[PDB]
Amino acid sequence: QVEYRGTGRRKNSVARVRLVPGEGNITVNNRDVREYLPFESLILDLNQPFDVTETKGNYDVLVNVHGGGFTGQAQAIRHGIARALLEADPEYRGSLKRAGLLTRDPRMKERKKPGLKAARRSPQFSKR
Amino acid sequence: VPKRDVLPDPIHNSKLVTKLINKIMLDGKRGTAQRILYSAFDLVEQRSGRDALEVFEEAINNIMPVLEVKARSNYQVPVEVRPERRTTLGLRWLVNYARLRGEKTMEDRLANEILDAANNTGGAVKKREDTHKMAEANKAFAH
Amino acid sequence: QKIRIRLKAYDHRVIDQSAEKIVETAKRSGADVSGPIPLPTEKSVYTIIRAVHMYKDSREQFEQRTHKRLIDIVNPTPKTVDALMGLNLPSGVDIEIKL
Amino acid sequence: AKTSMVAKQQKKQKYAVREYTRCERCGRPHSVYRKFKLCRICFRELAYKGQIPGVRKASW
Amino acid sequence: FEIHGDNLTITDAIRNYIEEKIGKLERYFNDVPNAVAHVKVKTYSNSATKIEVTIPLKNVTLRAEERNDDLYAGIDLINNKLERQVRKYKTRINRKSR
Amino acid sequence: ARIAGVDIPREKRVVISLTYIYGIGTSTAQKILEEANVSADTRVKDLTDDELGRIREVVDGYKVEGDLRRETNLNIKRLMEISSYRGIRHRRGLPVRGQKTKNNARTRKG
Amino acid sequence: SIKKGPFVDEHLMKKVEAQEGSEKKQVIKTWSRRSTIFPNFIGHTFAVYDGRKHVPVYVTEDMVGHKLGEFAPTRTFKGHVA
RNA sequence: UAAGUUGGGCACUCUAAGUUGACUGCCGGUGACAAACCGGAGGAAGGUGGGGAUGACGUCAAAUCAUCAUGCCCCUUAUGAUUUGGGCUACACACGUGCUACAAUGGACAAUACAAAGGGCAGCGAAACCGCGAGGUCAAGCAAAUCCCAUAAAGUUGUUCUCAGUUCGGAUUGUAGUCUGCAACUCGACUACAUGAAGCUGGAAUCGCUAGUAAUCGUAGAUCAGCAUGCUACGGUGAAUACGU
Fold this sequence. Notes:
This is part of a larger assembly, with 7 protein chains of 7 kinds. Chain B is mainly α. Chain B has one domain (1-143). Chain B is 51% helix and 6% strand. In chain B, helix 3 packs across helix 5 (108-118) and helix 4 crosses helix 5 (108-118). Chain B is globular. In chain B, 22% of the residues are buried. Chain D is mostly helical. Chain D has 2 helices and no strands. Chain D has helices at residues 2-8, 40-48. By secondary structure, chain E is an alpha+beta fold. The interface between C and D is medium-sized, with 16 and 14 residues. Chain A binds one RNA strand through strand 3 and helix 3.
């Protein structure tokens, strides 16, 4: 056979997307997406890259992953997939970039500075 | 200036559930909000059992206004709503009245509210009324 | 059979060019040298206020930098020893010759 | 005043701990470090000196 | 107000005098959220009697000070300032048409 | 009364029924019920004569009594008898470790 | 607490050693913060230096809800009006 | 192999230094053609990408003689200096600031998934062992990409509680203990048992915040014998609003 592959990066959560022809199926960390990532019923959005690219599908999956929480970690999945789909076919880049998901979000957390405490609240002023 | 869209609902392929779980999403806890709302889609779709959208869409066309007001000396003007603000405020009094039943369950107060509101009753159909009694009472001196 | 080392200085240019000094003098009389295998090069933090008596909220920060370099070489012999203890300079590096 | 206290933190002790690690250059006891034994502010002055490496600055 | 005295010990005589005076402002309007008083002997060496006063107001506040020979002259001279610094404010007066 | 001591609630689970008596908390209840092999299950007093003997007697293993109020009284009475430098701070709002009274008006004072 | 266990400065106890065998005394002056009651000190008096001046405290029988380090707290009336 | 544990490979991620990159730069339009602005393409990033540092002349006779230094004055068997103890923390009260409760969006209990950063030399004390736990015994490893510190919480799965001043609540006081310290009474923290105050979202008035923000839940570090509802730093989760001036 053959298998495609890519890397994933957001929110302190890294994924090495390994994307292979197949049924369309996930075992992240040799473990399924669904029970692993709480809760979670959001994985349509994870398959929307298939809803727009080579739609319907399907290609099976593998990925090693660590760091951060489910939000970025489920969201670190896609850009390795969609990038592996550029590597599959750059034709759908016009179908991707018009819809995103190969643009890795450059945003992340901030730093602290004087003003912050336990809850991220800057201070009051002198009333009375 | 844009309003940071939510993509679809991943439950029944609507959208405004997503806009609505986030309004139940207090403390940034999504799963408990999603939990209790979809549970309410079990309860209301059970009692007088039916589709989600009958009670939902009807009720949120029984309370979801068309005219609001704003002040400006102080003269309160009746105004046409932008439909995002319309739907926005409908859901606002939806949850912000949902607690205000004063009951126990996660969902009965909700499903009571949308069931009642599909029937043009309760404080959300009410705030639509009173709001539209500030509209066309105050047409005169500020429109 | 191998040789290994650890380096620690607080300038990123001098330390690796110095690695090229000893490595050049090493594969001169040896070979089988591991390249400059980098290391995470962690840091520190030190926070002080811009004040003397009061005004705590308005402050300033400092740190420390800490470079590490992992370099090795295989099939040892006394020549690469003299290449080790031959040319470490500038001496901000903290060589730790080992095996 | 601090002039005899200079000897106090240098004098011997009955036992282990009724002591402190004040600053050397200054005599401010409080707001000191066990790394360099310097008050809050001499560190600032001699960090600007760049006497020790030292870094300083603003990469956090 | 932290009626504190730098190098002068606030007696009850001084507190009575002070608060007594600000009572007169109940003309407008009191409404008493807070009030402060800074008094000090700053040697020149003719050497003072400094008075600085602070009034927090409705949606705003008004500080007031002054120096003079002695405490009582300083409280009386600084008076008739934190009244006109207050009076007037409002009205303001209606529109639009159209 | 009912089973033991005084003031038992009716049709309430064991989980707190055994706790309204003056001296039981929550774990000690779990112990004493574990001794007669009894548990509620779930919100209610399901008790017949069967376990009644053991729940009436196994409760006797301690001074869950007004004698514990008596224990308090006689112990503080031992305190303020002597000189007593902590029966004085017993009235201020201060336990024997100190509590630095500025906003302690308060519930140990009025 | 203490590391198993009760203790004394080992001069005060060394003093009452000389006080306690014979016809006892009703008088001891001391400083006595690092020492506390136990049944050898019975039948005697003590006067711990509060911080300004010692004051008599006679060792009574069950002085066990109490110790040596303090008997009239040096906050001393009160510190407060009420 | 239980295990990247071993063989091997650095391919991948990772890792630290020089590279290329975004500069209205390319185009289209609007524009005194210029200045520019609006739009579009690509691009990872389009309009000083985001933040950090850097804070003009200067005002406040701002603050600090107690950082250090110092003009002047004053002292000098004391306005200096040594020791044991106290005190710097007392409370009818008030001001500010924070923390914790006023509950079923939940409390009690069982099983289970996920980080970042950073400390460590005689310090980090792995496993095992004792114990209701604080801790106590032992001792492998390790100046760290290693070993250890250290296990994340929120959450997910369930059970129960079923709206009480309640398993809310968690102050109060006592009892019995662990660590450190020569020493835990004025004046250390914590563990086990009990006891269960007020309090049902706060009145007038009043405060912050434009997106990974707020809000919330965790983590480490210094200060250190002992000790942070504080400070600094790290992440996890994570929205509503922005018309218009």
